């Protein structure tokens, strides 16, 4: 199985994980991108004061979350369990180049 999406900037799409302590961690196409591989952004929120995703502060929620798209957001989004298990949602934003 697998989920492959296509959107455009200014749009917003829901991402999830059937295979559930977790962590969302995507990699985006390197060309015109600072980082060159899989990078974590969210980790499951503990019983305190938690929020903030590092490379994209526009993801709202449980790690079944909505994502507002813009420049460079094209890449695969992985939701990770405690051991090995990962739920990946591929993503393509319209007109992604220089």
């Amino acid at each position: 199985p697998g989920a492959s999406l296509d959107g455009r900037p200014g749009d917003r799409v829901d991402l999830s994980c059937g295979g559930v302590r977790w962590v969302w961690a995507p990699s985006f196409p390197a060309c015109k991108g600072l980082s060159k591989g899989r990078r974590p952004i969210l980790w499951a929120a503990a019983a305190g004061a938690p929020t903030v995703p590092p490379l994209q502060p526009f993801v709202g929620r449980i790690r079944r979350l909505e994502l507002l798209l813009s420049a460079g957001d094209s890449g695969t989004f992985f939701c990770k369990g405690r051991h090995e298990d990962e739920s990946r949602t591929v993503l393509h934003v319209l007109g992604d180049r220089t």
Partner: antibody, heavy 118, light 108 residues
């Protein structure tokens, strides 16, 4: 804001045909162009799509390699290049526009009839 | 791919009645299914997109209901103009699949 489909083509078996689809009003750079095959008195079949900026369109694996969608932004038009034609290819080929997954194929072209016969 | 099945391939119905077109999916497609209308030798019209939401300029009699994996289009008021084939389609994973379809005939 229409989609200008090329005139119906009669092609010999095994040969290749490049169909046309021209964008009126809107800029193709502002959507995904999708193509659909419709066998006579049968269901529709999604050929593949393309982000006009990319110019390396994704296709259905059942069609992989056989059909190659390539768009020209400069002429504000897309093209479907189908090769190694069979009687199983005699069908109508729609060119549609899509804003994304969550919006579907909104504007549908009139359709180009491809007749594969010797 | 995510094979799309439409329980019935033909549905006859009299004017001023309500009808339903069912569409079952090979896997949960998280409401990424649209509904299409193809008029006889007429153009193809996108009716409903992303399950429930009506497409611009499409009448209100058209209702897009849908569970996680089981989707059903419903034409509430029957009009003569509604004689056309209806198709469901998934956009969840990249080889987008078009269902078998259901031709809607008029009882008279």
């Amino acid at each position: 804001v229409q989609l200008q489909q090329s005139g119906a083509e009669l092609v010999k078996p095994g040969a290749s045909v490049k169909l046309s689809c021209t964008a009126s009003g809107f800029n193709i750079k502002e959507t995904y162009i999708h193509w659909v095959k419709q066998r006579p008195e049968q269901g529709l079949e999604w050929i593949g799509r393309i982000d006009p900026a990319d110019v390396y369109g994704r296709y259905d694996p059942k069609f992989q390699g056989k059909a190659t969608i390539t768009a020209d932004t400069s002429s504000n038009s897309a093209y479907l290049q189908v090769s190694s034609l069979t009687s199983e290819d005699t069908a109508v080929y729609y060119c549609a526009r899509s804003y994304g997954s969550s919006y579907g194929i909104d504007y549908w072209g009139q359709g180009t009839s491809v007749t594969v016969s010797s | 791919d995510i094979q799309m099945t439409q329980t019935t391939s033909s549905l006859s119905a009299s004017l001023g009645d309500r009808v339903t077109i069912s569409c079952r999916a090979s896997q949960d497609i998280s409401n990424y299914l649209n509904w299409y209308q193809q008029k006889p030798d007429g153009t193809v019209k996108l009716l409903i997109y992303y399950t429930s939401t009506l497409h611009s300029g499409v009448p209100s009699r058209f209702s897009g209901s849908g569970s996680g994996t089981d989707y059903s289009l419903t034409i509430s008021n029957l009009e003569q103009e509604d004689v056309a084939t209806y198709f469901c389609q998934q956009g969840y994973t990249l080889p987008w699949t078009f269902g078998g379809g259901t031709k809607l005939e008029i009882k008279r």
